[PDB]
Amino acid sequence: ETGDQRFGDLVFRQLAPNVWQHTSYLDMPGFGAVASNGLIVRDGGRVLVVDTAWTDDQTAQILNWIKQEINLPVALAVVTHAHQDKMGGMDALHAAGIATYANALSNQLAPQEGMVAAQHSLTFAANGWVEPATAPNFGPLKVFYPGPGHTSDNITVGIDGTDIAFGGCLIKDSKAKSLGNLGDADTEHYAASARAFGAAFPKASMIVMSHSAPDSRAAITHTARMADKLR
Ligand SMILES: O=C(O)c1ccccc1/C=N/n1c(S)nnc1-c1ccc(C(F)(F)F)cc1
Numbered sequence: 463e464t465g466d467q468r469f470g471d472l473v474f475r476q477l478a479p480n481v482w483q484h485t486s487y488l489d490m491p492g493f494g495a496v497a498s499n500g501l502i503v504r505d506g507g508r509v510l511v512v513d514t515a516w517t518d519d520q521t522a523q524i525l526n527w528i529k530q531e532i533n534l535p536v537a538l539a540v541v542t543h544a545h546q547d548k549m550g551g552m553d554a555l556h557a558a559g560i561a562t563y564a565n566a567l568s569n570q571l572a573p574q575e576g577m578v579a580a581q582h583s584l585t586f587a588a589n590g591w592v593e594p595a596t597a598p599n600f601g602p603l604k605v606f607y608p609g610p611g612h613t614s615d616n617i618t619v620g621i622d623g624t625d626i627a628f629g630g631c632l633i634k635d636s637k638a639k640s641l642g643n644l645g646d647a648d649t650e651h652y653a654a655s656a657r658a659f660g661a662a663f664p665k666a667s668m669i670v671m672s673h674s675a676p677d678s679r680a681a682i683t684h685t686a687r688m689a690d691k692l693r
């Protein structure tokens with residue numbers, strides 16, 4: 463709590479001199495607020511965003527918070543897979559004139575998932591690293607596709623010059639008792655994908671994820687341990 467800022471429906475937490483976490487909440491009618499996290503990154507004189515909020519209105523609130531608190535232009539956004547918690551606000555980013563980037567497969571699945579596709583598609587080598595020509599001027603964002611897990615399209619992001627990596631919805635916290643909704647999951651490859659994310663970002667000590675508070679690297683090995691049990 464203490465330290466967090468609220469702006470409309472959203473909550474913001476500073477993780478590092480130039481990195482903040484954004485949290486938005488879906489109101490599940492019977493259940494109440496379900497939190498989802500993304501990241502905001504100040505890169506010199508511009509801002510980069512990872513993930514939308516659940517809805518367009520909430521995504522607009524992120525951008526307005528950036529305008530109010532950082533007052534630097536948002537140069538691009540990258541969304542980490544084609545479900546509502548990470549791509550629900552695409553229309554808001556587009557309306558705001560932010561260039562948007564997603565895994566090619568996310569963009570291909572988006573219509574069927576009821577999401578709006580990003581403008582640009584990222585592609586990935588066999589070793590999981592983004593093909594650099596598809597991610598121009600990403601500054602410190604290092605984008606890595608670990609393999610199928612939470613979904614087949616899930617990607618992850620590390621921030622150069624920080625100790626932070628973002629596992630999105632693939633990674634659960636180190637006290638988690640399950641892997642959550644596995645309805646679109648690849649149960650066979652999940653564990654290796656979790657470990658691959660760990661290997662991509664070997665010096666990250668702060669692991670940020672969609673549905674828990676930032677954790678140590680314990681979150682990675684813990685998720686992989688649970689995932690091992692799906693085979
Ligand atoms: O199941 C979990 O792991 C979990 C745990 C805790 C909080 C959220 C989630 C899952 N959120 N989520 C992911 S991750 N990908 N998609 C969705 C989603 C959820 C609801 C809707 C709906 F309610 F609005 F329909 C849509 C998407």
Ligand SMILES: [Ca+2]
Nearest residue numbers: 518550553578
């Ligand atoms: Ca919409």
Ligand SMILES: [Ca+2]
Nearest residue numbers: 574575645646
């Ligand atoms: Ca689905």
Ligand SMILES: [Zn+2]
Nearest residue numbers: 543545612631
């Ligand atoms: Zn999902």
Ligand SMILES: [Zn+2]
Nearest residue numbers: 498547631672
């Ligand atoms: Zn999620």
